[model samples]
Target: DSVSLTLRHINVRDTAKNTLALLEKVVKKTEAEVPGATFKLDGVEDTVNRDVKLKAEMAAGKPPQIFNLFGGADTQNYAKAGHLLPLNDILKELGLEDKFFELREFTVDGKIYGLPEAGFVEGFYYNTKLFADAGITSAPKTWDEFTKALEALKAKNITPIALGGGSGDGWAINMLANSLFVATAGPEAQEGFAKGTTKWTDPAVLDGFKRLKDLKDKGYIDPNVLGLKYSEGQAKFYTGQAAMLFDGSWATSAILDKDKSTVKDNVGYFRFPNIGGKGDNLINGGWSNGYGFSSHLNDAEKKAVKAFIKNFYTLEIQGEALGRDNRVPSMKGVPTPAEAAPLTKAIGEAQASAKAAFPAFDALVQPKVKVTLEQSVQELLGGQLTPEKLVEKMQKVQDEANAGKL
Candidate 1:
């Protein structure tokens, strides 16, 4: 019998290529480990489409043997619905539980659901040459110093921040807003909202949105920010059109792409500045993407799945993946390539020093609540809504979702 694996992933063409290559290597290794086994691979195109199709397939008794899952809420949903296989035993056998980052997002009801294959930490990326020209030798540690640097950059007629807040990509605004929250109110404030212990209209949440407005009012962000896509924002920063880019580790590859970047050598990274009080030193975002075997898999298929995951998670494979894709590896002891962006190294160091790192707001909530929060965040960015209103709407959505559960 042939063993087929339907892997679902987001629609990134470059990432798709890398994933396919990784799968091919895994297939060859698995074939060696389990003789007479054949592997077939399928990559689902879109998140929504993948979810819908998987749901229908699972309900019809034809769920895929293995598939990729997103971090936080989506992982929680599948695990809660009993759609995911419990990997506690496998994790123990592989000794991955203690080897990876200790975070509740990777655990649901004290059982591991999936391996965190990659992490993404958001921060500020600055033009080293521009900062030097401004007589600033180091990144600002506090919000006050951050604004001062923005002023200094603007004095030189440069856009202090590059943001892409065009319509569908309102998520960029949320990403920045969440980083500010992590900087200002600390990780617990957002964690409170995720656990339903805090309201969205709380003062800290309101202040987070206020900071974004202040950045705009201060003319620090580009006027064209409202017209650019999220990717373009990083492009602007790479081409030296903007002084800083507020984004995650994924931007490192784009910034360091020799063919596409002009000022790659001048790029530098800093943690999201301290807001006003004792911050958690927690980064705003990191996604866990990896395969999970279906409980319905037969004995032989289970053995094959185990062999495949083990090969894929090896240090050699992980190092290759990170070097080729610039993805931060979750596996311990993988040698990060020298050609990897400086920002990637900085992120690894920062994570090593952080007290705790959690997923951003939408990542910690349920899928239903995530959609509502994403929409509310978009409205907040458009200036049609205030942070207070954004929080209120999110609370209402969450309340409704909770009621349905009870």
Candidate 2:
């Protein structure tokens, strides 16, 4: 049957080159293989204005057959508004209900609407040689041990952590702060925070903010952090100016970028040490990216789309997620090759050993509120906002967002 289908997504070479390159190949190949159907790409070209672009398309009743999406409030509102098509039956047909991780993120109640876009694991990426020079034999697993390593590194004039704490660099700073949530707020509270059942003023959340500040106060974080961008912050460690970085598994693309980073071989991955509370061994992880269908697709269109997706998610394709792109594959069945980068191996091991996983502070929140929280973290780390002030500001944003104030 002659049919037309459009796919829209925000993954561009600028943001994730390897993944996007492979994705484009899959899209091109699908068009060739599914000769009966005309496949068109409404590619966004970059990450900028991604959600805004998708919303505009949806509002115009011109959403692509498939497009990128987020879970939590974003997905929920779209699903409730009937802008999204239910994918429950489709996922079942593909036997994907049990093949992927965090499918719950794409669901509203018992219905699935999307498939996870990619998998991620966040923690500390450090200069292994720097740690050894400081006589650190292994990654610290607890608060005291971590602080001692920081002090030890500091004594040798090495910055303990490299971070982009500038208010203008919220994407970078927010991620750094989010990991500490697993340390102080605990996974249970963070999940509740996302549901609005737990307030930002909760002692656990406040303590999480405080612990983030303590990192800055104790000189673990770079003094000029607020002025730097993510790249400059990352450069500190790879250049041997800093000992570590608190970042996500996606960093492997750079940490292993042979041509650019000189210390790629010495890079190592480790989780944020347990600070306090019962948050020990909690990992900062969740479904951060996903994709779904517009409401207007017919069964034939869906079958074609399903065929496209299944072909793209095969063992060979998913293996590229770990082998070539340095990302965690959401499929539990996907295995890490023994020859994978050391940092990649370390990240897989961390995920396997994690007792629990929590979404980053901003991951499950609304867009505006997520930005607000990011700002709070920048201020908190820069000493412009205390825990009390940060929580109050965050609660105001959260309440207003709920009340349709922005």
Candidate 3:
């Protein structure tokens, strides 16, 4: 008799084809390792999986045998509900208990519940040609230089930054906003929001919002940015219509593809410049997304799951993602490919220069808080709400979330 199990993942998009290919191979290998085991691959869009389907399935106690999961609050919530299996024993049995960089986000009451597939660091993606056209010879290293770079780019009539803030994609806008907040408010203060130690109205937090508003007022960001979709904003950068883009390492594959990017050969990367704040050396980065197993599993399904984990999380597969997909390695002691593309090498250098890395703010906050910020940020960008009012609204939600009133 054959054993069967279901795995849910977010590799449905064309951009995710590389990862999907790697996962398919892992499935076949896992099937071979577990005799008479058949696995079902269920593909779902990233957002749909996280915000809709998975939530419904998890609440109904019917999540797949293996499913995609985010760390921090989401993992903690699920683990607390006894819905996820602690992977500590499994990792130890597989001799991979200490192989990952950090599993802090997936740790609940000191038990690990997930394994990161890869890591990501957020930073600036710029075009060398566009920088040269603006007469900027190098990436900015300080707040003044960064401001001047945007000014110079705008002076040359080039869009200084590519960003997306449209409805249904408010999270895209918050990527840069997250970096800016960390840069301004510092990592410690940024981390205090959910814990009730920091309010959204902190002077430093307001300063970051002001900086974003100033950028929009100065025509540094793309015009009508609030109307542009995430793909549209990315298209503007790759097509050479924008001088720089505030994005993540995951965006590297698209920005460097010869078929997709006009500036593929000229694309460069740099960390968000120091803003003379406490977080000057901190970078927005972490391993927060990965695979989690359901607590309910039969013996045969458990064996199949173990085989899948062992076969899928090897250094070879991690290297493939590194060399071909431009993903950051989540495991410790994995060597970066020497033949990596210039942009890939640049991404590593940028990360190496950071004093430390912080996960995205959304990962730390409650789900309701994340939703509020997404909508509040859009209001801030649309000029419909001042920084003071925005923070007030945020603090209200934060207080409610912390008090368990939400």
Candidate 4:
């Protein structure tokens, strides 16, 4: 009898082709090592899997035997509900417990539940030609210089930043919004948002919201930002319509694709400029997306799972992900691939230079609080609410969530 296992991963698009090909290789090797095992691959859109399918499957206690999962709050909640298999013993047995750089996001109550495929950090991806055309000499290092660059770019009639604020992808806009709040309030303050130690109405966080609004008010972001989707907004940057794009390290893959980007050769990356707050030197980053196993696996399925994990997380696969996809290495000793593109090298150097790193706010707060913040940020940017009103609204939801009232 064949022991079949479902492997649900989020590499469904053409951009993820390289990673998908590597996964197939891993699956073949996994099956070879485990007699009578047949691994079935199921691909799905990331957002749909994370927001809809997996949530339903997990609630029903029938998630795929191995599936894509986000770390931090999602993993914590699922593990707490006994829906995820604890990987501590398996990791130790496979000699992989010490292979990762950090697994804190996937750990809950002293048990590990996920294995990261790669790491990522958030930052600015800028067009070198646009900076030169605007007479900007280099990437900004401080808030003053950053604002000056924005003003200069605006003077040249260039969109200073590209952002998508549509309801369908509010998390895209939340990327920069969260970074601003972290840089304004400091990383320490972020840890307390869901614990009642920090309020959304606090001066520092409010100032961050105002900063985000200032970009829209001053005509620095794409004028139709609220109408565009994430992919459309990103097109503005890669097609040379915008001077800068605030995005994550993963964006390097698309930004560097010559066929998809007009300014592929002119791209450069830098950390978010220092805002001189308690969080100034830190970057928003973590290994939060990875694979989690179902707790309901049988002994044969678990054996196949062990073989899959062993074959998947190797140096060859790690290097290929970095080279082809610009993914940061999760394992401790993986070297930069010799054929890495310029933006890939820049991403590595930027991460190394950062003083510290903190995760996005949504990762730290309750899921309902995330929904409120996302909606509130769009309202603030769309001129529907003043910064004060927005924070007050957010604090109300946050308070309810913290009180276990969500």
Candidate 5:
């Protein structure tokens, strides 16, 4: 057929090398199955540059046959603009409809647009040694127990939790805050926010924010949290300077990096404890990364793309990629890697048990409002904006969005 297909991907700069290696394997396997097809891979510098590059290329009448999008509002924007290919039929054909979560995020007006790749679940990563030192044998299952454990850690002169609040990626802080809110108010609060059926000023929302305020007030977080970047906060936990860390499953891979992590063997994990509220016992958060074939491609290309995806999603390939790259698998029955950190295993279980899985807060909201909402969250965490004020600001953003003010 003399056909050549190029697959362009965006790799987070920190993980670029590992991602590239995985893509090479995919390319080789794809070519082996389809001899006439040739593959090329490109990794753009960052998310912003990748988006700008993709848009410019598409405007120039050329676009990559496939895209591996990172979560955020970009997926929705592309799907809305018809720049992304719809994949509902492909998913149905592959019988993958029920395997993924947060499928609605990639759908625009009932059209499925992407296949979820890896997902993140936010929760508490504990230091098994620290917990044992505090006379706690098992992970906390309720909010009160969790709080008491934190107090015990604090009394022992260890920071109870590590929070990342650097300047540029302040979004991490917001994500952790949102996770805490879900832990406190339950998943319904997130559903309410997403559907615009519940106001941010609702009592549950207020209570969620209040919980964060209490954490800050009690000095459970690093005093210089706002000054530390994501990496630094992760370092604090891995180095045993902090007894616990609240972050996503992504951190698990980074923390287990033999070259970087000093205490990978001591890490343990548990879901965010129940809040004595209506939430399920499981943690909240779900799959975010996904890929789709471009609608602009020909039938042959589409067929080849489908084959590529099938191979890409095989248990062996995904297991290897996830284990080597430190990503959580969305496919079922993939064996957890032996070296997979304990936290990764906990996240996988938490995701499966979650009563509701919410998309990343900024990713679920309208694009324009994401920036404002993220800023409000940062301010709230920094104590510059009170919880009430933050909720009011979020309400304004949600109202404007619902009214089509964007």
Candidate 6:
């Protein structure tokens, strides 16, 4: 047992304190059980530093035995580069072959390289009182219905949607943009273009922005939407200043935080209202960031890591996290906390109708593409960028990124 291994992960203490504590318990228990085995933990709190540090570590040939990583392109890129240790054999050895879902994000060439410690879903959060006061009988099922609801709210002199002003790095606008992309262009087209399997210049791709332009021209959005920060937009939604806010589960906590939001008790969540009724099941969802290992590890280090994995992901630990923290454990046996807020179960309840998932473009596409998309979406909303010109801007950046010209 004379092995020492280090685990590096995002600074998760704040965002996932319960899960982190349970993991720490595993390490402590393991070190207690395995004589001469030492487990070291390293963390980086900044999202950019957390990701960049891992890439730098792998590039410098010092990849940790188990490192924090997001799925899809993040894990896939590392796997393709031969820097990640495939977990297929380990899963078989540990009898975890049936333990997880959403493997597509972490798989490369038919091998799995990592596993998410937890998962979170993305959906729009709304002010229920605002919906009722605006005479919305139910959630909108189609783009037309959503527009009608927005108009109703506007007729009552209320902002249909609260949007923070500017081109800064907020994802609230991207939430609207992604829905627009799929609504006018079709989900298949956007996903395909992201993979180089389809072109972003398809006229249908640019058509969705017209709806936004209509909203802008008709005063459906906040008059000062372009001036407020995205964080401020969230606050407006929480206070029922606007009918809704496009966001995800993580933001649910903030909406419910008494310290930050007084209208915490009035919020609810729904899947993104889509263009066609047939597009009802899609939501911006996928597994959260997970843990992976370096491909180049000695047998002793591998043994230590295997033991840690086995201890860390056990149903008991997962259940403990769920029972206390409202975390949705990656494994299925655990349930959401009984005392959890209504919004905490938003994902679980939404699962019944989820036929497919659409992850955020920023999460799935190239980093540079995401930056360009965010900027272009802001411009499109501000009326400084036309739909046609917006498509051109997106495609040009995507092509440059594809050709490694970024």
Lowest summed lDDT window (length 10), candidate 6 = 344-353
Off by over 4 Å in 1: 1-57, 60-65, 69-83, 98-110, 141-145, 166-169, 223-235, 250-261, 275-279, 297-304, 314-316, 330-335, 341-356, 365-406
Kindly report which residue stretches of model 4 are placed more than 4 angstroms away from their true locations once superposed. 1-104, 166-169, 253-260, 291-317, 331-335
Count backbone clashes in candidate 4: 0
For all predicted structures, in order, the TM-scores are 0.74, 0.76, 0.74, 0.74, 0.80, 0.77
Model 3's TM-score against the true structure = 0.74
Worst 10 residues of 5 by lDDT: 350-359
Alpha-carbon runs more than 4 Å astray in model 2: 1-85, 89-95, 194-196, 257-260, 275-280, 286-316, 352-356
**Candidate closest to the true structure, highest TM-score:** 5
- Candidate 3 on 1-406: residue-level lDDT in tens? 4888889999998988999999999999988777899889999998999999989988998889999999977898889889998888899999998777668889998899999988888888999999999999999999999999999999999999998789878898888888887889888776899888898889899888888878888888887789999988888899899999988787887787768889887989999999887888766778989999999988888888889999988888887777776888777545557888888778766765566678888777888989998898888888998988988898898898999943
RMSD of each: 4.8, 4.6, 5.0, 5.0, 4.0, 4.5
1 versus 4: better lDDT goes to: 4
TM-score, cand. 2: 0.76
Quantify all predictions' global Cα lDDT against the true fold: 0.71, 0.76, 0.86, 0.86, 0.73, 0.73
**C-alpha lDDT of residue 116 in model 1:** 64
Write model 5 residue lDDT over 1-406, tens digit each, in one string.
7577778777647746776677778888888898788777766665654568776765564668887764446667676667777887777787776666567757777887777777767778878888888777888888899889988888888888887776766776776677667666666666676577777788787787888877877888776677888789888888778888888886776767778876688887777777777765645556666675567888778887877877776667666656666576666555656776565666655554655555566655676566776677667778899989888888887888878843
> Who is ahead in TM-score, 4 or 6?
6
Off by over 4 Å in 6: 1-17, 24-64, 70-83, 89-111, 167-171, 183-186, 277-279, 286-288, 296-335, 351-353, 364-368
Per-residue lDDT for 344 in model 6? 58
Q: List candidate 5 segments past 4 Å from native.
A: 1-4, 9-53, 69-83, 164-173, 222-232, 253-262, 276-278, 281-289, 330-334, 339-356, 366-390, 400-406
